[PDB]
Paper text:
By co-opting KBTBD4, a substrate receptor of the CUL3–RING E3 ubiquitin ligase (CRL3) complex, UM171 promotes the degradation of the LSD1–CoREST corepressor complex, thereby limiting haematopoietic stem cell attrition. KBTBD4 contains an N-terminal BTB domain, a central BACK domain and a C-terminal KELCH-repeat propeller domain. As expected, KBTBD4 forms a homodimer through its BTB domain, which is characterized by a domain-swapped two-stranded β-sheet (β1 and β5)34. The predicted CUL3-binding 3-box helices of the KBTBD4 BTB domain are extended by five short helices in the BACK domain, which is connected to the KELCH-repeat domain through a linker sequence. Together, the BTB-BACK modules of the two KBTBD4 protomers give rise to a V-shaped platform, which holds the two KELCH-repeat domains on the same side of the E3 homodimer without physically contacting one another.
For comparison purposes, we also determined the cryo-EM structure of KBTBD4 in its apo form at a resolution of 3.83 Å. In comparison to the LHC-bound structure, the V-shaped platform of the free KBTBD4 dimer adopts a more open conformation. Superposition analysis shows that each protomer in the free KBTBD4 dimer is largely identical to that of the LHC-bound form. However, the BTB N-terminal α1 helix in each protomer is tilted away from the BTB core, thereby flattening the V-shaped scaffold and further separating the two KELCH-repeat domains from one another (from around 9 Å to 30 Å). Thus, UM171-induced LHC binding involves significant conformational changes within the E3, which are accommodated by structural plasticity at the KBTBD4 dimer interface. A comparison between the free and LHC-bound forms of KBTBD4 further reveals an open-to-closed conformational change within the E3 homodimer, underscoring that the actions of glues can benefit from both local and global structural plasticity in E3s. Notably, UM171 binds to a pocket that is present only after KBTBD4-B–HDAC1 contact, suggesting that the surface of E3 scaffolds can be structurally plastic and might contain more binding sites for glue engagement than their apo structures reveal.
Numbering used by the authors:
A (entry chain A): 7 to 518
B (entry chain B): 7 to 216, 218 to 518
Write the structure that this text describes.
Amino acid sequence: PGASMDENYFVNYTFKDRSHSGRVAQGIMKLCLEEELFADVTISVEGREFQLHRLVLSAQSCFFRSMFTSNLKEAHNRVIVLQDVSESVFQLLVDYIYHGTVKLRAEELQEIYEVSDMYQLTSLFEECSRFLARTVQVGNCLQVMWLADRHSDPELYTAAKHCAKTHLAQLQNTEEFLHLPHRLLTDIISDGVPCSQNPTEAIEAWINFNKEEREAFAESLRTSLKEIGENVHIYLIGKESSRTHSLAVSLHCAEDDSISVSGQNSLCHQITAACKHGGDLYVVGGSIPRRMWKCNNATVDWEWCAPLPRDRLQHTLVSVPGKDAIYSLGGKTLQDTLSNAVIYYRVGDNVWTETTQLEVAVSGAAGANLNGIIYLLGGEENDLDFFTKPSRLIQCFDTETDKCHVKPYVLPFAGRMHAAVHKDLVFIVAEGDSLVCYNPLLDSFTRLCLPEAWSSAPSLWKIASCNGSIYVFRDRYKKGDANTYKLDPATSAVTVTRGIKVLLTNLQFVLA
Amino acid sequence: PGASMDENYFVNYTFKDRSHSGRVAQGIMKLCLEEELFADVTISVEGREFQLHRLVLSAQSCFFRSMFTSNLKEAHNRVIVLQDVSESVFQLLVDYIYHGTVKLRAEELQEIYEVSDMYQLTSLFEECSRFLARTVQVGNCLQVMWLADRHSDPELYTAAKHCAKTHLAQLQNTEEFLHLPHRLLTDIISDGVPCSQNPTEAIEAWINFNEEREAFAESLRTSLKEIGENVHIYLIGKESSRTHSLAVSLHCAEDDSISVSGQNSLCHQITAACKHGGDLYVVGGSIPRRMWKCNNATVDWEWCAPLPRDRLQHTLVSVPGKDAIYSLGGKTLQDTLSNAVIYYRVGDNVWTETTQLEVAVSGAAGANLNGIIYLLGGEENDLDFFTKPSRLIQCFDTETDKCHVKPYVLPFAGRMHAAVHKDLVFIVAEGDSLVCYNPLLDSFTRLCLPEAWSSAPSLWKIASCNGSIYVFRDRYKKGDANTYKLDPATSAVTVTRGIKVLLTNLQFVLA
């Protein structure tokens, strides 16, 4: 305020209180939401009589705002009937509107997606969309795709597209694929079908349904049939100690969930840290200065890349496709000093730079690359007495605006955990059998601990995610077969899957 | 956080978004306060018929909540009628329950005082009571007193007593005084009525009334305590004849019978001065650390402990809260500026230094309010050697010691003088630019005084006492003295009696 001759405090000024939001907005939280006292309309769903306010409904769902505001000849009654929603689904909806904690079931999940879009709740619809982006299986990604192009939700129509494009071979015989309109089929094929699924045969088998008139589209479909070559899934790099070598094998999952070896490339120098970027290794090791060797599935010959500045051991190498970069967060120097120097290697130009340092230095952490944010889980850190105490810190170093955003909560455990990104979640495996299902968006931990029957020894469990099903691996086994389990997160059922016959499983190693 | 295995993130969930504060709290303010909609209950005040929401009325009030809740034939009709409320006052309550701006005037201020207390409105009964504690003149010092002792408000009953016991002599002739209840008269007498107002005669008025009220003979006499008046204006100024600085003391009276008081004398020069209680603390001389404490009629200049950190042209304020003489800011002779504080006590004589300020300032003015110390105006220099005036206001907390700048600036800057008055902090700059401060409302107020009076630019000093602003003009061209009274209700500058002060210089004026 600068002036006004009329505002004279002794006769006439103008009151201006700054507590009109801390007493009216925050004030109306017990009279409306918690303790419903004054209710206006009675929405009726099936054979029920709900008592819902006319105020809080129009502040969230704009569709309800149009039905209440637009007074007409039918607005004289306070009983409003609904038709689309069921009796046991509207209650879940009215539980979200008032409180904000709706328990999302499994079977009644496609029903809180169709009705949550007509009411235009832009917060539940953006969460039921993420639910359908991670529960998609090989037999379900043909109705979900049809369910995403009708509501115009590109965050699901693309997440449910990389299920019928990487598994088109099995879908060939299915009766749902035969009725697929030409509009959707020109997107599944054009998205880069892998060669192993026979993309050129699905088109031919599909057009034989209505050859009387469907032959016109046959020529156009074969024009856009971009096929991407087959990659190898897990770069299991075996660090044998009996023989000075490193059998960097490349496991290749089959169609029926069977892993087979596809290369026995070897190196003589020691290994400090390893990372895979797309389809190639970028292992780090050797005597000083810290070198880098890059391998490939088909090359079967190690190349050479730009030397590592700031040589150190126990890195936390991560790799992103949303960023042609390979970071080197954390690590401790040769003099047992926990340093923090995030590096910004690029594959296009073999040159190193430096970026914003971490808030807290960690060594031997876990590298998770969920979304475009690099997550550092676990590790070790010395608090006061020069002694490395196993810490539990979740750092969130970014890649767009480089800054550290340490979360205000800690992990259930600590140590030398190994992470493996799966869909939106980030699975974690501790020094034992305590597999957690940490979610970076909801900030919750749902540890689905396996039965302690197979816990004879405190052996670390390596975890790898490939083809939409994580394969929790096993270290050196007591004179037997490696426990290459195939844990199914949906059912928490662990199944022993063999097919790998290697001699490096007798000793510890690194993974990718 | 955490969970257990009944929360399988593939088929189970507990989705809980911590964002029901911008979609249910912000989405309701614009649907109820700003854009009034979905009205259900109609309030039928006399003459008119308003429409109000059931959720906003019961969220700020309590009488309005315990009345809609009880449906004992009080909410089913929905044509409910309110009584003992005028048409105009209720419209200003809708303006307050809703968006939150009120236009409190003087015509309707007692009706909104009682009505806002009947409806249990909490925040409105903290500025409508501050208003009454701000405009109690002698003529209505008793209609407000009895109003205060009906709703149990100590912020007004203890503020309508300091302004109703000093003017006890004039209230004696008033008819309302003779009808005083026995309880009210007891408290106003036993608070230190000045000896010049004849406290003994006040009881004699009831004695000479002519029964039932005449039985009080020994009562109300043992509880009377008389103290001489000692709060007045201290004036500092050197005569043109000699360098002997004078400290003439004058006191204001309601009868305008100014009597010549003792003329205090002093030898050295003055750097700064403070007014605490009924004594004057003078700093200055050849060495700035000299503390020559003076008084009314003791002619004593006892030298106290010197200041450990010597400063020149600093600010002295008295916050009785801790019987302290806090010396905030200052100037250092070693090509730098001081930021320390030294509060010389009376029975302790301590030199403690607390936390410094946030923005450097020197040669400013200070005014104390309810313990909180405000530093306003002054000058600040920079490494660029630029004489940039400072328009930043500083607050010195009395409880948390959290000095911080305010998100605004004064309308002007330079060398100013400040003197509190009721709940306001008046500001006078170089010219006719009166500005009234208000820490609670965080707002200002000017008067737009024309410059036709200040022909020559000269410093103006302001002193406030007995609820009447006094403004003193400095450096007149050998003419009549200027003791303009600045009654802030309406601009009523009148020259008072021409006392022969004969001081053509004004160093400091303290009230």
